[PDB]
Design a binder for this molecule. Structure first.
Ligand SMILES: CC(C)Oc1cc(Cn2cnc3c(N)nc(Cl)nc32)cc(OCC(F)F)c1
Ligand SMILES: [Mg+2]
Ligand SMILES: [Zn+2]
Length: 338
């Protein structure tokens, strides 16, 4: 379609992992999700599955991207575009093609687009302690994560032109709705170790056991049967959206550092607001006046990222991501210089 040249060049090598998302951000004028969305939805053929026009998809991507806050350093349209790029990369790998169905691919790419819609640059704990409208609305239980999915479906189905699910069947939409909701809710922080351990115990450990008896067609069909079940497909979806969300430590060094600055700046603004209003300081280490960003990223990678992407790597085979992870980890160590 008639896209401008810089934005067209910015989306040149979108199938590759090494991708300049900030050049696309700069080119699109903080509209990376609509341009990258139209291409990624067309490549997979999502409107052919959903039975929507291109005009419906443009209106859908605009109203959602509009509700992403530009004022937030990290949690904005450019993050979800990078998370959409991470999702599309994992779907394009052979393990995920063989395992997941086309309905899961549509559920994954839609979930990534909406997963932080109307993020206020503030955590769940902030809104619970502050007594926010959403914290009261969702009863201190997945305050942001429930609001993201809910508002997304309010904006989609509430308007006629925005609704991309209008021509679906009753059964197909119900499954896809439950798929997207689950993947959006899976990104909440407190269920990290629940969703990671389930992926190890139900997929990786059984798959490691099944690999002992050669590479026979009888054993390969049992691996095909075991992975493709509805329960295991859900656990892969929960793991894929979680890895796609926090893929920034496994990006190229230039992009990794930029994501680290934005998330840190966002937490410093929260900590300044927590002290000013007199709220309890839930994230004490993330203060601009005391935080070491290199050391904090090392702590962040060790706690959450290292074990998660190790499990995800064994399943999918991601030598580029783990090579970047090692390169970025060694960089943060090198910045001490004392
Ligand atoms: C306490 C706080 C730092 O914990 C977090 C923060 C985040 C959000 N987040 C996303 N990219 C991040 C990054 N590069 N550094 C930091 Cl410090 N937090 C990041 C995700 C997460 O876990 C992954 C999933 F559970 F959400 C856990
Ligand atoms: Mg989130
Ligand atoms: Zn996110």
């Amino acid at each position: 379609d008639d896209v401008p040249p810089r934005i067209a060049r910015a989306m040149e090598n979108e199938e590759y992992w090494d991708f300049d998302i900030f050049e696309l951000e700069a080119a699109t004028h903080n509209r990376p999700l609509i341009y990258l969305g139209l291409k990624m939805f067309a490549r997979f053929g999502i409107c052919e599955f959903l039975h929507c026009s291109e005009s419906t998809l443009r209106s859908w991507l605009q109203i959602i991207e509009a509700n992403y806050h530009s004022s937030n350093p990290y949690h904005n349209s450019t993050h979800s575009a990078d998370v959409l790029h991470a999702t599309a990369y994992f779907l394009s790998k052979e393990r995920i093609k063989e395992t997941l169905d086309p309905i899961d691919e549509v559920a994954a790419l839609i979930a990534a687009t909406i997963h932080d819609v109307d993020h206020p640059g503030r955590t769940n704990s902030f809104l619970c302690n502050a007594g926010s409208e959403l914290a009261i609305l969702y009863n201190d239980t997945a305050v942001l994560e429930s609001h993201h999915a809910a508002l997304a479906f309010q904006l989609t189905t509430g308007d006629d032109k925005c609704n991309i699910f209008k021509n679906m069947e009753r059964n197909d939409y119900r499954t896809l709705r439950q798929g997207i909701i689950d993947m959006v809710l899976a990104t909440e922080m407190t269920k990290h170790f629940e969703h990671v351990n389930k992926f190890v115990n139900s997929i990786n450990k059984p798959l490691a056991t099944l690999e002992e008896n050669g590479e026979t067609d009888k054993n390969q069909e049992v691996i095909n049967t075991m992975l493709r079940t509805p329960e295991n497909r859900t656990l892969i979806k929960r793991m894929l959206i979680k890895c796609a969300d926090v893929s920034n430590p496994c990006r190229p060094l230039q992009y990794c550092i930029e994501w680290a600055a934005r998330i840190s700046e966002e937490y410093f603004s929260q900590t300044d607001e927590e002290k000013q209003q007199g709220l309890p300081v839930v994230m004490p280490v993330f203060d601009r006046n005391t935080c070491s960003i290199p050391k904090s990223q090392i702590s962040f990678i060790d706690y959450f990222i290292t074990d998660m992407f190790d499990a995800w790597d064994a399943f999918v085979d991601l030598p580029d991501l783990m090579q970047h992870l090692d390169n970025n980890f060694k960089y943060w160590k090198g910045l001490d210089e004392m």
